[PDB]
From a paper:
Mg-protoporphyrin IX monomethylester cyclase (MgPME–cyclase) catalyses the formation of the isocyclic E ring by cyclising the methyl propionate side-chain at C-13 to the C-15 bridge carbon between rings C and D, generating protochlorophyllide (Pchlide). Recently, the small monomeric protein Ycf54 was identified as a second candidate component of the MgPME–cyclase. The Ycf54 protein has been identified as a component of the MgPME–cyclase complex.
To investigate the structural basis for these effects of the A9G and R82A mutations in Synechocystis, crystal structures solved by molecular replacement against the WT Synechocystis Ycf54 were obtained for these two proteins to resolutions of 1.5 Å and 2.2 Å, respectively. Superposition of the A9G and R82A models on WT Ycf54 resulted in respective RMSDs of 0.19 Å and 0.28 Å over all Cα atoms, showing that there are no significant structural alterations between the WT and mutant structures. Upon closer inspection of the R82A structure, differences are observed in both the local hydrogen bonding network and surface electrostatics. In WT Ycf54, R82 adopts two clearly defined conformations, both of which form stabilising hydrogen bonds with neighbouring residues. In one conformation, R82 forms a water-mediated hydrogen bond with the side chain of W78, and in the other R82 forms two direct hydrogen bonds with the backbone carbonyl of F20 and the side chain of E17. All of these interactions are lost in R82A, which may alter the stability of this region. Examination of the surface electrostatics shows the base substitution to alanine changes the surface electrostatics from predominantly positive in WT Ycf54 to predominantly negative in R82A. It may be that the flexibility of R82, along with its associated positive surface potential, is required for docking of Ycf54 onto CycI and consequently mediation of the cyclase reaction. The structure of Ycf54.R82A, which has impaired Chl biosynthesis, ∼50% reduction in CycI levels and abolished interaction with CycI, reveals that the R82A mutation has reversed the normally positive surface electrostatics to yield an overall negative face. The rest of the R82A Ycf54 structure remains unaltered by the arginine to alanine substitution; therefore, it is reasonable to conclude that this residue is required for Ycf54 to form a stable interaction with CycI.
Residue numbers in the entry: 1 to 106
Amino acid sequence: MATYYYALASQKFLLEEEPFEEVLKERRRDYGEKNKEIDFWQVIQPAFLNAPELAEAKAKAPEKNVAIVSTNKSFIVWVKLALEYVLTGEFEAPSDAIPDPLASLD
């Protein structure tokens, strides 16, 4: 099991008002340059948020949501600093509650 860090926003905010697709893409390009394994993702309507131990974040979260997830904590700190309007946290996977950390409910 690895520790996954996340920043969670509403779909409206992270897909429409402040879309991150190019940020992620340019980061994939920098990783390709150095042959680094990709360790970050966008997950729309993440199934991780239905996990019993994230119930609090589920209560706080907008109904239609989306996360940037990464095993690199400092990336997520950077996303949080850049975006502001996000929930953040961490979890462990895979587990019974979180079989696939990247699974979408949508």
